[PDB]
Symmetry: D2
Subunit: 123 residues, 4 copies
């Protein structure tokens, strides 16, 4: 099956955040992201891109972006990583969360972390 | 002016890569990215998101993704950072470049770097 | 706190790498690191620094460096993160692995990842 | 190579931070780091490691760590990158700044950035 058949759907990370992901035939990603951490309370939309043609036995490289804006927050996260559809499906990512700052404070504006997404919510 | 008025257009980074960026009213980013490094030879499409409503005197947080696939490459980069439209416009970013690997080799699959984009190509 | 009483010792990460860590009273880290991945085959020494006085209910921030040199490898990794002693001890880190390159190739010189260290080797 | 003959000394980054670096024959780095940003006001000691034998035309990979502790700060930074001595000397780095947090807040504990060090203070 094509990548979208395995990639489109709901994914959950270790923080119990929920991503409703759609992988389109043109290689784009769309959908909604609900973070269980940070001062956000509803899903925010995502946009990204993903590999259509992974070499056999290798991951689908992919990445996506979310802009977060509410009364208190003006930031954007990107996730970059690989989706593996075989055996135990997973999206293994690292992410960069850049927050709006004064130009002089750019040095302290970007958080880095890692998220692992699976098809079942963590207990 | 709204963010798109200042953000849409051609941007160049320190590597002399050229990004043709369009900032849409719905907060999405689209366009094309031509890297001057790596074994890629034509532009690749991008998708991302950006802040619509930056607090006064602060950056527009934003991020975008490119999937790179050709005969030799299966990878994806995301950039995360801030766009400043005042005085000397700049997009200051950090990026994560994830390459397709076997699942056991995920540890060595993600490069990290930084790109600074301006409105004029470097000499 | 007496951080060294909990921090000094052998630690194992998810890749089954083994770190023999000593935390000194002056806030320095020394020891040996044996990676189970990459083209390295013997332990390499480490040097780092760690917080001596963690706030109650919070992690000990710490970081260390390893220089790797053999016939084919010239690189260095740093790990940055937090050590939690109070329950299920762990060192949660992100790391940066910089490899020797030509100056023009710096953009592709740094890998990023994450390692979780515990007191028992993974099965 | 005799790396220490070029590496030991005072270095300045883009933020006008000043690092007094000593590179020892055993491959260790020691010295003092004075940051011009963040709520720190005195130098803090560093510990690290560096490549002793760079391949011709390539950088010396290196990394170091600083633990920062004062009345309000408990954090640690590591820098990872490359030192180039042969022309216009520079240390090109990326860094990870981990701050003490509750275990549940680890996701927001690590900043990432980049520092370029040269032998002359920025204007
Ligand atoms: O606090 C913000 O600026 C907005 C919410 C950010 C939540 C981040 S995104 C990376 C990490 N993974 C998640 O599922 N949530 C956090
Ligand atoms: O080599 C690849 O896997 C595809 C090309 C990657 C080029 C990267 S993306 C980050 C950095 N910034 C650029 O303008 N080019 C490189
Ligand atoms: O390949 C090299 O350049 C030297 C070995 C690097 C091994 C890395 S360090 C980060 C990660 N964690 C480990 O325990 N091993 C790898
Ligand atoms: O705020 C802290 O937690 C301690 C000071 C951190 C200063 C950082 S380290 C990375 C960057 N480079 C510098 O020269 N200063 C900042
Ligand atoms: Mg909200
Ligand atoms: Mg091509
Ligand atoms: Mg070896
Ligand atoms: Mg895990
Ligand atoms: Mg101080
Ligand atoms: Mg610069």
């Amino acid at each position: 099956s094509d990548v979208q058949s395995s990639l489109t759907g709901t994914w959950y990370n270790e923080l119990n955040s929920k991503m409703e992901l759609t992988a389109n035939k043109d290689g784009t990603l769309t959908g909604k992201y609900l973070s269980k951490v940070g001062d956000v309370y509803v899903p925010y939309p995502l946009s990204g891109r993903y590999n259509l043609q992974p070499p056999a036995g290798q991951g689908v490289a992919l990445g996506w972006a979310v802009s977060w804006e509410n009364s208190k927050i003006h930031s954007a996260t990107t996730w970059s990583g690989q989706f593996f559809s075989e055996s135990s499906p997973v999206i293994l990512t690292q992410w960069l969360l850049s927050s709006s700052t004064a130009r002089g404070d750019v040095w302290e504006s970007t958080l880095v972390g890692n998220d692992s997404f699976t098809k079942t919510a963590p207990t």
